[PDB]
Design a protein around this nucleic acid. Sequence first.
DNA 1: TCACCAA
Lengths: 339, 338, 450
Amino acid sequence: MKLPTNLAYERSIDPSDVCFFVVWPDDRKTPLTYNSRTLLGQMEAASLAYDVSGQPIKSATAEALAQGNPHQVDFCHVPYGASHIECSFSVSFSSELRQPYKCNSSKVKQTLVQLVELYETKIGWTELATRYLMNICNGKWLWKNTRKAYCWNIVLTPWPWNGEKVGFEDIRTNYTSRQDFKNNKNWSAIVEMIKTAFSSTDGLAIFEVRATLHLPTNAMVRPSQVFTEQNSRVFQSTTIDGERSPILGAFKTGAAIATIDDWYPEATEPLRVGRFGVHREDVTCYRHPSTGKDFFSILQQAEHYIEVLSANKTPAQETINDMHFLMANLIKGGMFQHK
Amino acid sequence: MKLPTNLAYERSIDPSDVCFFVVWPDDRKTPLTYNSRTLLGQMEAASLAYDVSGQPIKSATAEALAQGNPHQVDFCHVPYGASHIECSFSVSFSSELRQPYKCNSSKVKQTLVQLVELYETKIGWTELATRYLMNICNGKWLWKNTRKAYCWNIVLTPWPWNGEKVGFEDIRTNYTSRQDFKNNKNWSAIVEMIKTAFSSTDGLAIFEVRATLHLPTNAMVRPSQVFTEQNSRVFQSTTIDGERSPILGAFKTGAAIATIDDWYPEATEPLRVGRFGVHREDVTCYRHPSTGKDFFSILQQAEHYIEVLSANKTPAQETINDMHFLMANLIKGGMFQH
Amino acid sequence: TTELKRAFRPLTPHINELDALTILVNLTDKAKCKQKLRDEKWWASCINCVNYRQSHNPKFPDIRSEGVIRTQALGELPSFLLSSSKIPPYHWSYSHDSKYVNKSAFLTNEISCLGKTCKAMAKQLADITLTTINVTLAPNYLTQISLPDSDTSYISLSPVASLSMQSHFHQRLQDENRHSAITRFSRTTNMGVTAMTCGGAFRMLKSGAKFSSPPHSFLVLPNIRVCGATALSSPVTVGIPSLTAFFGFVHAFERNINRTTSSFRVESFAICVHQLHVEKRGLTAEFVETISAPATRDDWQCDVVFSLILNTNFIDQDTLVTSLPKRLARGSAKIAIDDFKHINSFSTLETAIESLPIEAGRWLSLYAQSNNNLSDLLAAMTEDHQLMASCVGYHLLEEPKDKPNSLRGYKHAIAECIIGLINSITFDPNTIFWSLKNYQNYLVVQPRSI
DNA sequence: TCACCAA
């Protein structure tokens, strides 16, 4: 099955920026702030002591190496009399994977709809909607702030929802595994929102997440930081009360909800969902185009999965993990052209 | 009936841009702003891993394809401690559909003008004015903004009018169907403005529309964005006070008022009114000219549509949907040469 | 061999008589050796390229158009105006097919041009046919404008972009990142050779700095807010839209009111601009027959909020609002409903100008300083960073004739734009008011004070 | 109908 010269989806999950507040002991809330400050490190770089060949640069004497290396970073930290920190954003789940946003082949548009329709008939939205929702309900979107902290607590406010706000108190102790989320008072009701969001031709399901970080005394908080082409660490920011405050990128927050991919060969750790799924720690793609298990090698066998999903015999674990990866890209979005 | 080599009308419906504002909870109204901020995504393109024959490329190894891909986009979002967003434009209905803008043939100029006075006599402007006004009063002109929101209100302000500014509160709940717009307190005082407009030698019918969008916390907004030949998502803008503000176009708006066409042979969704009516989800032409139901194969039948409407019998749905589609393109305007 | 290619091509200035013409043979390639090869089909087809050598390119926005122009800017015009007459007329080019854009480099590279050697010359001299207008108006894509001549009877005008003004502006504006505003076009070999060399980018003249308005029988139209107009006021400059567009707005506002009161007749109109905001938006053209969009271009637009003070020969509220015209240079113009209170007339100019609200704008007064060149323009654009140049009138190219297809049954002549500099007064009442002036060879919206 | 063409 060939790929058209125009194909694209929108995404079915829509996050926003995360804003940071300082909650004082009197329960009053002030936006967080930061500052740039210069420093003076050593001159450890190994381009400054050793040449490309390996032998030492002869102009880098003992006295010269220990000279002091001045730089500049942005520095954000919790104030002294503060108590905790509020983080707050909002997600959507909005059925953009039902059909292509753009497609100029008539056969391919009819086939990709039958994948999405035979996936919910035969496999169902229970596995995906659980995997996305855990990353909201813990601090996966509070990336490094969660690490080195006493406790964090998550509070939802879903919109097509009558009463009884949803709470998750003291993660790292209470909500460790999958079953610890299922034992919640109202958990299956929220999973039924995202299942009804994806199953409906207008499913909407707005969440309103709010977190609470108890950091140590005078601790450090790490926001997202900018791309630039002399400051060496420039934070992303907005404006809340006329004072600039650090924020967690909307794109960054969507990159944390969607760390789901662990269906690759010899997989240990959940990667971010993407075409030929990369790993930014060690700079390599798992699911390489020679592996046979990236996206565009599963798209070009999309007729083969229709003879599998339509039969009464249940499909093997190789050929539903190829379908879990296939839907999780159609929720991610992107352009699927060729030539 | 053969077409002239000069035929054109002006447009009958004339929109404006859509400004976006921010309402702080102390009822302070501030115009909306945005920024350009650089991101860094993966390296998915299907050309960077595969060559033209479709065989895997040998330059992009496992390491070269996991590298980093920096790009810049304009990013508009709702401010933090805001309440809602007031989106306001204005329409007009001056009935430019009466006589042509340009025509060389005077025999042909009778035929298109005598269709309209045969149309408002036999069928009348009830049907199309029902359809256009159900794109102002709901959220078609808000485009993507209506989607992924809590609720939105619409408030009209017509010009030849006395009291009670027309309100439409909580769409997606109340105003879902055609009849629910009719069951408003003053719906037939406004359809009788568009009907008065199209049937008068100079009938005017100004509106002044104002929406109110209650979004989630800190949410995206989607304005229209530019078409040129670096920054990959450049928003359209206008200067309100001293701020840059994202707008929605004067042609992005008027395409939303004129999504009417469900008169084609296999119609499951309304389409924007135009010659050989195109769809941009799937790049196809419903009403393709080989099918023979495009707009130029209706002007050639405009003589047969004079003996149809002069018969005392009510004509069928097969041959008044051609009459409705003929009217909606003369309302849309544009050159008709061949 | 790239610097020899650009030196003969019409967007570089010009330039021991044997190296040249044996290079001029070798610019049909896509040397002295293939200079010897004499195809009889190469000699007879190279004569076709001078036959479509063109003075003013009719294909400049729209490459679908159809016509040949080898004529000169007709007449003469005063010091403060500027057309393709005042610049020496020799940068011409090829406006035909993309098949022959390299085979036109043998006889159209031009200080003058090269327009059995004797056998070729006899045919060429008879058909050289300089000063040629070959346009038929019906099956092509041309602009058309009705403008009144004398007391009554309009004249139809089809402006055509001159080539000697384009390559003039493209060369002088290289060093200026501030007064230059690039528009790019696509399918550029179908345009012509004078668009191949620049690559499609044309390097227009922008109105310098930004717009900032300081505080500042006469019927007052307040807050005429145009949403999406055009900034391409000429084929040469971008900025505030042309002043035949503000004139055609008022003479549509007059001519509507002459349905009831047949002697209305605005004499002059005062323009007060707030808030330009020029920007490159987009233009999705409509699908045209194999059914796909037409060629992709680039379009500048502006969002004017101006106010207008007329000057009438001598009326309800609801007669005015329904007889407002609804387009000011392709853009929808509107008054808000709450501003309808301010359409009342007066008798003295000092009260009519204190009458309108939102006071913080500049009245348009022409900068009547002798000029002839773009450096004459740019020198005055720095002493006043708020001075904005645009199109002020149309400089003709032939006398208006009877054609079989014309705009609304009038006499049709081909015109070219005229670029003037435009002041801004704080507030000479006559100077502020503009009117339509007819010159036996042009038509320029001047103030009364000239 | 298709072979033509650039920065």
